Every structure is written in C-alpha cells, then in structure tokens.
Symmetry: D2
Subunit: 295 residues, 4 copies
C-alpha cells in the first residue's frame, strides 16, 4: 500500500480578539473558530513513524494565536490567506495549507438609542465563513460563504407543474409557506499570492454584504415558482455584481410546514384559503443545490 | 407500593400560526413548541391498566392545534392559560394542566428600509417562554422567561476580594471579559382564573420588554463587581417596575475567556493591559443563580 | 428587595481518572462531568458587592480535581458525598453543597475474546448520574439515576380503552411499536453523614444494576397495556429489591413510529398485520411520568 | 450566467423496517436515515421555472418507502444501489442518483442470557453508512463507512521526535492517553450495475466487520508512534483483506486529555508517572486524515 492523500492539523480552535481605540474608548470584538490542515512531504509520518516531518498540531494552534496577535483577523479572507501563506513559506516541505474560519456574530448593542462602546449581542447563529486553500506555486483559492441564515415567508411561494406519475401524491399549490436555512458560497478568482489578496481587501466585506442583501431581497420579493428558480435568481445577481467571483453555489433545505385538516372536529376549516395553524415538520426536508457560473 | 405523583401528556408539539390582514395584506407569523402534561385521578392507568382515565396524548396534541385555531396564540401567557383551563374544565377527573411554551423568533424583514408584509428572519435563538400551571380550585400560576440571550462585554467587569485559601489559584482582576447566556424568569401573582389573566393581558408583553431592556442596559452599563452583584441589580429593577410580579430569578453562566501568554514567542506581550487575543473556554463554566423577592 | 434563594458554583467540569494496577498491568478509567453549587451566608455577594463570602468557582474547580486525586471517584454517590461534605466542613458560612455527577461509559474492550488491559469503548451514550445534596445539620440526600437508555420493541405493546370524545382521532391498537429513552431515578433514605454513606457503599452499584436489569427485563417481557402500566411495574420491583430506597421515578418519552399507508401505490399493503415499513417520528412525543413510593 | 452543476432531492428521510419470522416468532428491526439527490437534464427548473423536469422531492420520499417495502434494506450498499438504479431507469432525463444512508444500531437484547425475540437496544451512536452514486452509463460507485466509534486507551500512545522551532511548546511524551472518534471509509471498485452489486452482497457485511475488527485491534494493540502511524496500519490491513476495495480513508480527531499539575496544593504529585486525574479537552482537537491505496 501507499499514501494517496494526507492532511493533518488542528480543528476547533476558538479565537477572540479585541481592538481598543485609545482616543474614543470604543472597543470592537471578533470571535471565530479556526481549522488549519497541512499537506506536503509528510507521508513518512504515516508509513515509517517519522515524526520529523510533523509540525505538531499543538504548534499549529500556537501559530494561529500568534498570527491573530500580529495581523488583522478581519476580513476572514485576509486572515486565512496570511495564516496559510505562513505555513507554506515557513516550512519547506509543507506545500499546502487549508484554512477554514467560522466567524461568530458579536453585534454592538444599542442602549437607549446609542451604540455602546464595549457591549455586544449574539444577534443570530448565522455565520460568515471562509475556506482558504494556499497551495505552493499555485496561489490562493478562496471560497467565502454565509450560512445559518434562517428565513420564512408566509405566502408568495408556489409549486405546481411538476412531474406526476404513480409515485406522486403531492398536490399542486399556488400558495404555500417557504422556509429555509441559507448556505451560499462565492468562489473567487485564483489569487497569485498574499499581495494580490491584500490588493482586493475591501471587496471581501462588500461582496459578503451584496450576497446577503441579494439573498434577502430576492427571497422576500420573488413570487417563487420553486426553490430552484428562486435560488438561481440570487446567484445570477451576485455574479453580475462582483466580476472577481467565478461561481456562486447555494444549498437550501425546504423546511416544510404542513397544513392541518381539522374538519373532523366540529367542521373546523383550516385548509386552503382558511389555513391558519400549521405543523412545522422537523424531517424530512427537501434539499436543493446548484452551482452557477458565467456563460 | 403506590403512586405518589404522576403526570403525562404530549411534548415537543411544534405549532405555527399566521394572521392575514385582509385590508392591508400584512401577514404576521407565530411559531412555538408546546408541552402539555396533565394530573388528576389517573393513578389507575399506572396501577391497574385502566386506560379509561387517559385523555390520549394524541388527543392532547389535537387539542393544542384546535385551541390555537380558535384563540389568540399571543401573548403566550394567555394561550397557555386558555389551553390549561380547557383541560381542567373539560375533564372532571383532570385537576391540573401544566403548559410549557417556547416561542421562536420570526422578526419581520426590512427590505430597502421598508417592513416586508410577509417575510421574516430568525434574528436570534433567544426564546421567550412561559410555564403555566392551571390547578383546579387554585387558579393559574405563571412563570414567564427569556432565555438564550447571549451577550459579551469586553471590559468593565471585575472580580477581586474573593476568599483566598489553599485551594485558590485565581488571580484578582480589575478588567476582564464577561459573557453569558441570560435565563431570566419572572413569577406572577397567582391569578384566580382565565378572566383575571385576560384582564392583565397587556402587562405580559410589557413586562417581557421591561425584563429584556433592564437586562441589556444593566449588563452594558454596570461596572460589574461580580456576576452575583450585577444580576441582583437587574432583578431589583424588574420588581420595581411591575407590581404584579412576586419574584425574579436569574441563572447565568460565566462563559470564560482566558488570556493567552505568548511571551515565550519572541517576547510577545498579550497579557494584562496588552491582552488582545483570548481563548474562549467551552467548559467548565461558572453558574450563578439567585431568586429575588420583595422585602 | 431581598435575596430569597441563591446558589453558585462551577458547572461542566470534565474529569478523567485512571487506576493502574502495578502487579497485573490492568488499567481502569473513569470519566465524568461534575457540577458543584454552594449555598450559605452568601447573600451579601449579591446585595453589597461583598466578594469575601465567595469561594471562587475557579477554586471549586480546583477542589473537584484535588478531591478526585485523593479519593475514590466510584461509586459516584460516594464521590459526590465526599465532595459536598468537604465544602460544608471547610467553610463555616457554606451550609449546603449540591453535587451533580454524570458518569460516561468507558467499557473495557475485548480483543480476540480477551479483555484488554488498557483500551476502552464508549459502548453507549447512556449515563449513570447522581445528585448529592449535602446540607449542614441535615445529612446527605442522594438521588441516583440512569438516563439515555434507548430501547425499542417491535410488538407486544398495546394501547386501547382510552377516553374517546370529540378531540379524539387515535385508533385503538393491540399491536404497536414501543420505543423510549429511559430516565429512571431512585431516591435514597437520608444519610446522616459521610460515615453512613460509606457504610452502604456496595449498595450503590448493586442498586444501579438492579434498576437497569429490572428496566430492561420488564420492558422486554411486559405485553404492555400502556407506558404508564409498564413503568409502574418497573418501579414497584425496584422498591421491593432495595429497602434503603424511598421512591422511584420514571420519565419516559413515547417515541412514535407511524404506519405508512402505501395502498395508493399499486394497492401495496403496509398497514395493520401487513405493516413492515414505518416512519419514525422525531416530534411530537408522548411524555409519561410517575413517582412511586411505598404504601 | 448558466447552471454549472445541480442536484436536488429529499434529505433526512427516517425509515424503519421490521422482518417477522412466522415460524420462530423472531422479529428483526432496521432503522436508517436516507438522502436521495438527483442530477440530470433539470437545469430548466432553475433557469426557466420549468417544473416539468422535477420529480418532486415528496415523490422521492414516497419512492424510498415503496422501495424499502419491496426490497431488502440490508446490506445498505444493496438498498442504496437498488434505490439509485430505480431513479435513473424510471426517468429518462435523470442521469445520476446519489444515495446516502445512515444505519442506526438496534442490537437484540439479551434477557437472562437469552436473545429476546422482539426487543432491542441502541447500544452505541456508532453508525454504519453508505454513499452510493449511480451514474447512467458509468455504473455504481460505493463508499462504505463506519463513524462515531469512540474509543480511548490509557497508555501505549507516544508522541516524540516532531519538529521543534520557535512556534513549539509541546513536550515530547512516551506515555499519553489517546482517544478518538473513528470515521473510516472503504471505496469499492466500480460496479457495472445492479447485477454486479448483487453478486458481491455477502462481501459488504463481511468487509464492514473486517474494518471494524482491524480498527479496534490495531488501536488496542499498537504502541502508537502517532495517530498518523497507527491509522496507516489499519488501512493497509483492510486493503490486504478485501481485494475489491480500492482505497481506505481515515479521519481521526485527537481528543486531548491534559495532565493537571496540582503541586501548588500541598505538593500533590499528579504529573508524569504520577498522573491519575486529567482534564478532558473539548476543543481544540488534532484532526488527522489519510487516504491509502494500493502500490
Ligand atoms: O420548491 C420545491 N422544489 C422541489 O423540487 C420540490 N419537490 C417537492 O415535493 N416540493 C418541492 N418544492
Ligand atoms: O463573577 C464571578 N463570580 C464568581 O463567583 C466567580 N468565581 C470565579 O472563580 N470567578 C468568578 N466570577
Ligand atoms: O402508552 C401510551 N400512553 C398514553 O397516555 C398515550 N396516549 C396516546 O395518544 N398514546 C399513548 N400511549
Ligand atoms: O499523534 C499526534 N499527531 C500529531 O500530528 C500531533 N501534533 C500534536 O501536537 N500532537 C500530535 N499527536
Ligand atoms: Cl422540496
Ligand atoms: Cl464564575
Ligand atoms: Cl404517548
Ligand atoms: Cl494531534
Ligand atoms: Na513550503
Ligand atoms: Na377537572
Ligand atoms: Na459550613
Ligand atoms: Na435516466
């Protein structure tokens, strides 16, 4: 036998950083969870008990903290690029660094209508993430995403005209609930290295904001023919608004809310136009995916 | 042997309800998870296989839906009181109904600075809950709460002057991070029945808002001597602002953020006044509780 | 206002301990999660910022480790009693210690039909727990439990003869699936102190084993009239087999498995006597409870 | 823009099936969670609101139940192959079906030393899984796995000789705890279709058993130089014992257990050879991966 692929590192590294403005007293906090996995000429650690090729995962952890101390942690695309570049430059035999960052929300509190200088709220479990793959000789590949954005619309979703055969029981509808947890990813053009990533830094926060805004507005305003049709509209708009993105991918569950027929009880009418009370279904769920690129 | 206590019912009943304003087109959604457990002259179901005394848990589920269809589901204190009253009135042999409701957030979306008529976001996993105990001949006992309100302040928390002995390693501090998940409960005066609950309906949303506002403002503004001292201030203010509450209870974890000494690496200074990068600790956690009443 | 109740301490303290037999080489591992909350003359920490009365929660954590180092961690009833006694004896002003222990399974592996001296498997998420309340002047109150014991029987469960009215849709059945997650608690006679707890040490593991065995055998063998009737049989047997228990409490979800009518598809018969494929329901669930004592 | 990739279907479909032997009375249960995602000439559902190409996800759900009713659900490699083949054969325009199955444990209970005919226990959260990709014109690709197999050894793990530089603080060790959650995958040779899968049916359960046995024995017996070295030994043995496997992949967290220095308290010795009480660390964790193939 032989090693065909290998990577190793430290996962689930929780990191907080604070910035304190001396002049104003305003503090700003950042919290993330980081994973770094390395690849390179490491196969002998597996095949021959050769630990000399292993940068210890404990040392990878230390390096995450040190890097956070000495560099910006925002935008996460930048932090991940700095961190991954460090490993492939520092260690001759390490040839790729795969950096995943989950950013947690700490939104500044408003108290009596004024932003508070040092108090924050987790206003959502929605995350902003990056996957940064730094590959020696092949630049930096970045996938940015938002996930855990949970939404519901109570009308202006439809689903009719689907295939009907002997496996089909679903009734056509022209008015249903639609609820999902949005997972949206935008894949950047390959960057040649850290200098190029740094040259585009403002685009990272701007493109996250665009993706989020397009997602919410399109969800809210599209009289949806299907999850498929609505998500495609989101992707096409994001591509039209950032030329440095190559593809946009959505993965959307259809979190079903079922009508409840109560007519067996005193003729109570709770279906169709009279539907008021529904049963949210925990499982199963539709799962709809697509990757959209440029024509 | 003999039955000393018994209760039974249906848990984890997910319920959605929509209201549609015909004139304006504005829709409003409510989602909760409901548990109803009944007590009464039911011991023979346990001791003699006497199912005649059992209102089936499936029927309890049906009744939750029917009640939601025919009554307001908001405020949850009211819905729970209506629901619990139903069981003790409908069934001679059922003498108590214990209703727990967890309310999930569906906050109306703003799109282009305008509230959208039928689109919503789960803007937090924070919950609003009630426990409503309807006991035949003994009125209605209501505990209202908020939970899962996750906050962090980056300074203006202290902890010094605690007991120091041979088990103590903790260093005194005059400047630390404080983060918690707030669980706050206000216990209402006993209500004589449904009429009295209904007579106080506006106070339920108003008192939830007061509790939340006091919690956030006190957290943000108190230069905290301890979790103990800060939570007491919250409780005393809530009692002062709603005379129909008898007690306020807080349960607060101290979700620790530890400094990271990096001085072993090139003399990097990251402790005390120089602390920027911290290690959030998943466990263990302090857990601080108190119940405050009127003197 | 005034403090009506208060307790505080450290939660979620993970603890592992190993025993190494020098002669045989056999190692044995224990892992638990511990919570200790203290009560006493501590109100001024809440009302006056008086930290002098606070045994720091960090120190409580240290004390858990130290106590585990110097004493047996098994049975958990004993460890919790030692730990709680320490706090009320060491600190004049601390008058109660509430110790919760969750014990995690590390079952010795068999390799090639032989017990391995130092390798273990988590063979279940089933837990063994204790709640030990040590109250100065009032002895030691112990509740022992097993939880997370997940079982299913595919027949020999029935449910008929329940109340039927205008809220009832459930069909009577003489053959259904029954599945639950067992949470069973046995409450010991008050012990006067540590000496008395120690005098009964062998009874703790023996009574846990009895409770588990009775639960499994009764579940498997009872042609169940209801969850109520079956759980009562379990409780009565446990009381009959340990005189030092005062009560036994069960809390059992009825984790429903629904038939699926497939007759709309080519007349396929999958209900009643022909039921083969079922839909496990995540929610809602029946929840059935009782506390049984001696007549 | 244009669709570059798309798939859709139903996730989180819970399925139970019972087999009842009429002669013996012995019943046997199977429970799984199924996901089916389809690909094909479906792009117009995304780009033109063309639902005519959509086999409804509700219909996919129905089809899972129907298929389970009319075919074996074990081994999961077979069920997934039957299910995926159905979709690509039934629907001209569907060209791939991706079937994921998670199998849940229901192990027959022993009562008084005898296997019970219809009572079962969830004896572990360990799962057995398959990913079956049925691609029209390109056969059936199967990845089998076990996951959630949680183990610990208390000695006979080492880690020394790793790279040491200015980022390194980790001390070399010749005796540490090693604990992990095993995720192991074996990738089968491409099968030409259902007939070929069926021809190898006994190999599926046999190879799962081999993988599990090799994992446990190697974990228990290897005086481990690193997670890397130990996992490689497991993979090489599995490849040597099933020629129809092409690769074996492991993904192993290193779930750290840290020593606790207690020497600050009365000189208590709890490190090195005296280490008895440890602090299990929830995060971060090492994460070690490799894919092994034939030389
Ligand atoms: O938007 C939807 N897309 C689908 O593919 C689908 N299939 C259903 O059964 N419902 C659905 N709703
Ligand atoms: O606010 C705090 N209260 C406490 O009781 C405590 N104990 C610590 O170790 N830290 C603490 N911080
Ligand atoms: O064992 C059962 N006990 C109950 O109280 C019950 N109620 C149902 O609807 N099903 C039930 N099954
Ligand atoms: O088995 C191990 N492999 C590693 O790569 C590693 N790195 C550490 O810091 N510890 C480790 N233990
Ligand atoms: Cl769907
Ligand atoms: Cl604390
Ligand atoms: Cl039930
Ligand atoms: Cl590691
Ligand atoms: Na390199
Ligand atoms: Na009554
Ligand atoms: Na005392
Ligand atoms: Na096809």
């Amino acid at each position: 036998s032989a090693v065909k692929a290998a990577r190793y590192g430290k996962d689930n590294v929780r990191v907080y950083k604070v910035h304190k403005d001396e002049k104003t007293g305003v503090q700003t906090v950042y919290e993330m969870t980081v994973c770094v996995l390395l690849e390179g000429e490491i196969e002998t650690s597996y095949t021959k008990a050769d630990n000399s090729v292993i940068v210890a995962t404990d040392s990878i952890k230390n390096t995450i903290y040190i890097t956070a101390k000495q560099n910006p942690v925002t935008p996460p695309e930048l932090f991940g690029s700095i961190l991954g570049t460090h490993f492939i430059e520092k260690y001759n035999h390490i040839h790729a660094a795969h950096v995943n960052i989950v950013c947690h929300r700490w939104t500044r509190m408003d108290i009596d209508g004024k932003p508070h200088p040092h108090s924050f709220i987790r206003d959502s479990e929605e995350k902003r993430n990056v996957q940064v793959d730094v590959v020696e000789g092949k630049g930096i590949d970045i996938k940015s995403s938002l996930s855990g954005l949970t939404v519901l619309k109570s009308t202006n979703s439809q689903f009719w005209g689907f295939l009907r055969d002997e496996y089909t029981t679903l009734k056509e509808t022209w008015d249903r609930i639609l609820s999902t947890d949005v997972d949206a990813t935008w894949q950047w053009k390959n960057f040649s290295g850290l200098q190029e990533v740094r040259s585009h830094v403002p685009k990272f926060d701007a493109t996250w904001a665009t993706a989020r805004e397009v997602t919410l507005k399109t969800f809210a305003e599209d009289n949806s023919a299907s999850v498929q049709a609505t998500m495609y509209k989101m992707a096409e708009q994001i591509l039209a608004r950032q030329q440095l993105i190559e593809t946009v991918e959505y993965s959307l569950p259809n979190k079903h809310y079922f009508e409840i027929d109560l007519s067996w009880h005193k003729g109570l009418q709770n279906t169709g136009k009279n539907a008021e009370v529904f049963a949210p279904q925990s499982d199963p769920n539709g799962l709809i995916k697509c990757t959209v690129g440029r024509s």
